[PDB]
């Protein structure tokens, strides 16, 4: 009676529907859960948000062009500014969450394309200038909501003022790996004649057992497209790609006043 | 009671109950416990009010009946001097508009006679307390020509005697249907025109009103002419108890224009137009 | 339901229009005059009756005074021009 | 193995089947039955035309156009002319009747619209004058096979004469209740993006046990279009909807000579 | 009963119960046997009479209502021929002070309608005698625009016909409150003004009077004109029965100016001074 690609994920007061779905993967074959007693590493008492933050958020719809290149987003810092997640952020010093990453790109049964929807632990971009190295600023290197776009290109600024951001080259994958290989990691690709929802479940992966967000990028979401779109009457259509993300099992600890970074 | 509400949290499965198909036939199906997270509410609030019993359980009013009381010295005045009235529901559009929510009903019909009174003139002297008679006459019974003949003494039509200051008289119908229910709409005449007659039936009414006869009530001040003309007014009541109905229709939207289901011209834009689709 | 006593009003750029708003109620749940306009209140003796001080008439406005009576929401307007040499 | 949406109907010696249909509706949740021997009205011995009568009858299909309002049959007077159930009629004074009402109307993948499919009792519809109340002719009001039509205008004649005939205003339904409200009733909709075939299974309904089909109209079959058709490259083409019906557990009573009513 | 008295002596001891303290909250504690020496007083008396359910156990005045029946020539003479009056408690200053001890009640309502009667003028004539209405307007039923419309036929309506001369009309109206208690004082709006509104609701009233709807009490004379004008007097009232309340508060002491909790200026002072301090 029931099938692979009907699925429902409810989490607090939000919910997908899908029904042309793939399966989901559950990266490294774990769910994301608390922090446990025997791993603790403050000794605060842990406020946990227990539906107000566990939801889904719906990002901004960029629009995938058949010259479009692909997109990026660091998890825990494109979630900033959305909600009370947003304000569980800044009002703590540390964080820690679980995640369900669900990419949503549809399109009729004449169009043809493939966007790999990777997640990254730990995704490190080069800089894009030669004067300095390790060298990003804050800013550049954290978006937020609009996350930022990759490019077929490699024009690195002799400006130490403008080469302060991610040199986001598509075929090396910013950190200079090669793109085939990054199926290494927790993906799936959206094919526009089987799928038109990628869903992850994305535990939280770091060394520490708890740590900063504010500093601390743990995941890298990463659209790539690997065929490019392609619809035969208009050469040149659009079709939107739109992020939806959930926090999950979600707990903060050193409550304070509010964290405000800066904007340039 | 009605239903509580269940103690439920967040789901990710293959059981959607969220999505139905309309083209089946069936309404929506999903309760609130299906497409959110939902609390445990313990209910304890009931339908009890909105039952068809307390749903008709009121007297309304079904017409006014006016009635005098003088010297008739022309032939207007002495058919003033009674009124008979064919009993029906639908001389209001309240009673009646509650009514044909249903197809067909069973009741036993209660009824209640609130009955005013004035002088017309000024200085034509005084009158004394007045009794009203209310004559129920079955389809077949003569109805009064005058009102004094030989029809009011009524040896078998059920009359009651109100006097006048006393509390409203009241009685109860049993239900008088020929068919097992009352056909509220009936889709069909009284006969059949057959071919080649010679009758011409070419005007016989549609519908409902060619096979109600449920009586006549014909009223008469039961006192001589007084020297002051009193002018009555009577406020027939109906109050349906023992309720039963069948076969559910939607609710009378613009106004009636007669007896049956018919709309007039003027009034057959029920709804105002709002600004856009977007107007809260 | 809702009267707005100065309906044509005649006034030149820049100046005070005064407009008088009450309803034809004794309860006046919720209402008030939708504009983008500065005004701050005329004093005015009774629950019913009222008037706000508009001022700084720019260019051609029609607002809306609104009236929750308890039977539903009414609607009145007032019409008012500029004067420019 | 087995699916709602292929369903195949016998009755007597006639067959409808249906590889996209909906579900069916057995109206008020009682299938028709005959009258029982504590509920009888007449005392003669009740003629019961087995397989002769309780079979699928074809009607004329009407064409639905992009302009097409609605139709409306009378159910027991839709079949005066249909083979022994025609002759059943009116040579007996009493009949009751079950129904099977189905509605065909299909169109490709690329058409849209939909069809309230309605069954309604004891359907009193309005006069098309304001001269008199409840007035409406035999002819007028009983068309038999071709039904009648709805009208998104009310224009009552000045005449008695031309107005002694239903004034079928679509959006007041006729009686002048609104047609959003007439999903009371039991009905389908039929949807051409999701079936194409709309079933009713419609159990004899009156007051009495039993009834003068001659005079008395049981139910009123209603087809409304609530979105028209919209077939892209010809915006005015027709698709046929042709009305199939079967009366079910059929029992006459008085019999006598031929009843043959007016044609004028 | 209330308590009794125990026969007690003299002390001297640690034990002190002469001494509290009143920063902690608490009210006083020492009862006479403690300070003095008592006797035995056997203490039948009992606090019966003022419980809550005897507390407001009186049917008080809430309101006046005129209503006439005369030929109306003008528009004027049409609006006296009904009167419609909000349903509230706060039209008189003693049943509303009676349930301003409280915050919160839940209260099935008695009402009684005594009634009175009178001519207008001297020499035009006599009238019969008369049935009033009273319709119990819900808050979405239409109110009465005239004194003989639609609306006042009541075909769902609570209406009663009280026949002039008769014992006064009572009925009980049961707990109607959308609340679980009728909140006397509600410390609050009826809607958030938002930031940047182009609505501009700076004349929303504060407080009470924007929740409350318990209806309409509408009254018509039931008659149609008499030659000599009837002038009306109709005194609903109150009697709460079935009391609970919750969370008391002192009672008003300053003169009411409307339906709030305001108080005008010229009554700000409700003691009147001593001589001195040491005034027997």
Chains 1, 4 share one sequence.
Request: aromatic share 12%.
């Amino acid at each position: 009676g029931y099938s692979d690609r009907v699925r429902q994920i409810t989490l607090g007061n939000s919910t997908i529907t899908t029904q042309e779905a793939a399966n989901a993967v559950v990266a490294y074959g774990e769910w994301p859960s608390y922090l446990d007693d025997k791993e603790a590493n403050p000794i605060d008492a842990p406020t946990e948000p227990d539906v107000s933050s566990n939801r889904f958020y719906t990002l901004d719809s960029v629009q995938w062009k058949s010259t479009s290149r692909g997109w990026w987003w660091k998890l825990p810092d494109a979630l900033k500014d959305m909600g009370m997640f947003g304000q569980n952020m800044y009002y703590h010093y540390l964080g820690r969450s679980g995640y369900t990453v669900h990419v949503q790109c549809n399109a009729s049964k004449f169009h043809q394309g493939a966007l790999g929807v990777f997640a990254i632990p730990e995704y490190v971009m080069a800089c894009n200038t030669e004067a300095k190295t390790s060298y990003v600023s804050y800013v550049n290197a954290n978006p937020g909501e609009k996350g930022g776009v990759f490019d077929n290109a490699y024009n690195p600024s002799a400006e130490a003022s403008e080469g302060r951001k991610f040199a986001a080259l598509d075929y090396l994958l910013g950190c200079g790996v090669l793109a085939g290989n990054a199926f290494v990691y927790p993906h799936q690709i959206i094919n526009l004649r089987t799928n038109n929802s990628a869903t992850l479940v994305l535990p939280y992966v770091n060394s520490l057992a708890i740590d900063c967000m504010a500093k601390h990028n743990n995941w890298g979401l990463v659209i790539l497209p690997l065929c490019k779109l392609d619809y035969a009457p208009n050469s040149s259509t659009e079709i939107p790609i739109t992020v939806t993300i959930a926090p999950m099992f979600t707990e903060f600890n050193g409550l304070r006043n509010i964290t405000v970074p800066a904007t340039q | 009671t009605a239903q509580s509400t269940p103690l439920t949290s967040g789901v990710n499965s293959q059981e959607v109950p969220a999505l139905t198909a309309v083209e089946t036939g069936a309404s929506g199906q999903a309760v609130p416990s299906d497409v959110i997270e939902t609390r445990h509410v313990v209910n304890y609030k009931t339908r009890s009010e909105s039952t068809l019993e307390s749903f008709f359980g009121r007297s309304a009013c079904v017409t006014i009946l006016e009635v005098e009381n003088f010297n008739a010295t022309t032939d207007a005045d002495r058919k003033k001097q009674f009124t008979t009235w064919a009993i029906t529901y639908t001389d209001t559009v309240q009673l009646r508009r509650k009514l044909e929510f249903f197809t067909y009903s069973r009741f036993d019909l209660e009824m209640t006679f609130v009955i005013t009174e004035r002088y017309y003139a000024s200085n034509t002297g005084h009158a004394r307390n007045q009794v009203y008679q209310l004559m129920y006459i079955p389809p077949g019974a003569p109805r009064p020509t005058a009102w004094d003949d030989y029809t009011w003494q009524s040896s078998s039509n059920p009359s009651v005697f109100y006097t006048y200051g006393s509390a409203p008289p009241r009685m109860s119908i049993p239900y008088v249907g020929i068919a097992n229910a009352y056909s509220h709409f009936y889709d069909g005449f009284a006969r059949v025109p057959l071919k080649d007659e010679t009758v011409d039936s070419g005007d016989t009414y549609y519908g409902l009103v060619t096979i109600n006869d449920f009586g006549t009530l014909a009223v008469r001040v039961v006192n001589e002419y007084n020297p002051a003309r009193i002018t009555s007014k009577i406020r027939v009541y109906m109050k349906p108890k023992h309720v039963r109905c069948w076969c559910p229709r939607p609710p009378r939207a613009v106004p009636y224009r007669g007896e049956g289901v018919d709309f007039k011209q003027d009034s057959i834009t029920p709804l105002t137009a709002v600004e856009n689709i977007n107007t809260f | 339901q809702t009267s707005v006593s100065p309906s044509k009003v005649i006034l030149p750029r820049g100046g005070s229009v005064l407009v008088t708003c009450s309803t034809s109620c004794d309860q006046p749940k919720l209402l008030g005059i939708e504009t983008p306009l500065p005004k701050k209140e005329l004093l005015l003796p009774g629950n019913n009756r009222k008037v706000y001080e508009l001022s700084n008439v720019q260019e051609d406005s029609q607002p809306m005074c609104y009236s929750n009576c308890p039977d539903g929401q009414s609607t009145a307007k007032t019409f008012l021009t500029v004067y420019w040499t």
